[PDB]
């Protein structure tokens, strides 16, 4: 129960962080969002793709 709920919390927190971080930004290098949120390039890329789909 706690594992599932906390995983969803992680997902929502990451989504909010990406949205706020990239609000003051048109075209952006993905390495920059990775630097700003302190995650891996691959993970941020996958989450961004999921957001867009």
């Amino acid at each position: 129960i706690i594992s599932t709920h906390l995983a969803k919390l992680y997902d929502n927190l990451l989504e909010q962080n990406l949205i706020r971080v990239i609000e003051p930004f048109s075209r952006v290098q993905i390495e920059h969002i990775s630097s700003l949120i302190k995650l891996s390039k691959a993970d941020v890329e996958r989450k961004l793709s999921q957001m867009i789909l």
């Binding site: 129960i1 706690i2 709920h5 906390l6």
Partner: protein, 105 residues
């Protein structure tokens, strides 16, 4: 037949199995049946707190009413604390989890 307390026990076991299988609507149906049958007989502290904890788990999973989920979790925690039961740490963990997911850490 007799032993309506065991009726409630079996119904809650079925609800736990339903939720484990992830059929939340049917788990909720089983929980509502268990609670209606529990509001006609004596619920020892153990069964009352177990019903409360299962209610908390189901509300946490499905309805997204984490305030009520916390309420039921806390009733379960108080009951298990009164009974001096091993599984009160789990209830307290769920309490903290509700207080987190409510975005009030």
């Amino acid at each position: 037949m007799d032993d309506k307390a065991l009726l409630v026990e079996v119904q809650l076991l079925e609800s736990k199995t339903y939720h484990a299988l992830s059929n939340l609507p049917k788990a909720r149906a089983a929980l509502t049946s268990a609670r209606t049958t529990a509001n006609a007989i004596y619920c020892p502290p153990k069964l009352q707190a177990t019903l409360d904890m299962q209610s908390g788990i189901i509300h946490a999973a499905e309805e997204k009413d984490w305030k009520t989920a916390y309420s039921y979790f806390y009733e379960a925690f108080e009951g298990y604390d009164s009974i001096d039961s091993p599984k009160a740490i789990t209830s307290l963990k769920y309490m903290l989890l509700c207080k987190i997911m409510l975005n009030t850490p």
